[PDB]
Amino acid sequence: NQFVMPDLSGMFWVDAEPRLRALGWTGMLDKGADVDAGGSQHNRVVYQNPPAGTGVNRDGIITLRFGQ
Ligand SMILES: [Zn+2]
Ligand SMILES: [Zn+2]
Ligand SMILES: [Zn+2]
Ligand SMILES: [Zn+2]
Ligand SMILES: [Zn+2]
Ligand SMILES: [Zn+2]
Ligand SMILES: [Zn+2]
């Protein structure tokens, strides 16, 4: 908890990461398993950890699962 986690749902990774990095996030990305979530969700953020509203550390680990 040094910056509040945003809701990244629906973003492409080309937009998801720079948004996090701009918040000061210097931590490591854990890219999780893809999620088959239909065509509209293809390569968009489906899950995230920590959830939005959670205080995450500047170098804490963030996990993303993208639409298959
Ligand atoms: Zn863009
Ligand atoms: Zn990167
Ligand atoms: Zn992938
Ligand atoms: Zn499918
Ligand atoms: Zn489809
Ligand atoms: Zn797909
Ligand atoms: Zn993908």
UniProtKB/Swiss-Prot annotation:
Annotated localization: Cell membrane
Domain notes: The intracellular kinase domain and all four extracytoplasmic PASTA domains are essential for PknB function and cell survival. The PASTA domains interact with peptidoglycans and are required for PknB localization.
Note: Overexpression causes major growth and morphological changes that indicate defects in cell wall synthesis and possibly in cell division.
Swiss-Prot/TrEMBL induction comment: Expressed predominantly in exponential phase. PknB levels are regulated in response to hypoxia; its expression is down-regulated during hypoxia and recovers to aerated levels upon reaeration (at mRNA and protein level).
Subunit-structure text: Homodimer. Interacts with the FHA domain of GarA, FhaB and FhaA.
Family: Belongs to the protein kinase superfamily. Ser/Thr protein kinase family.
Source organism per UniProt: Mycobacterium tuberculosis (strain ATCC 25618 / H37Rv)
High-level lineage: Bacteria, Bacillati, Actinomycetota, Actinomycetes, Mycobacteriales
Name of the protein in its database record: Serine/threonine-protein kinase PknB
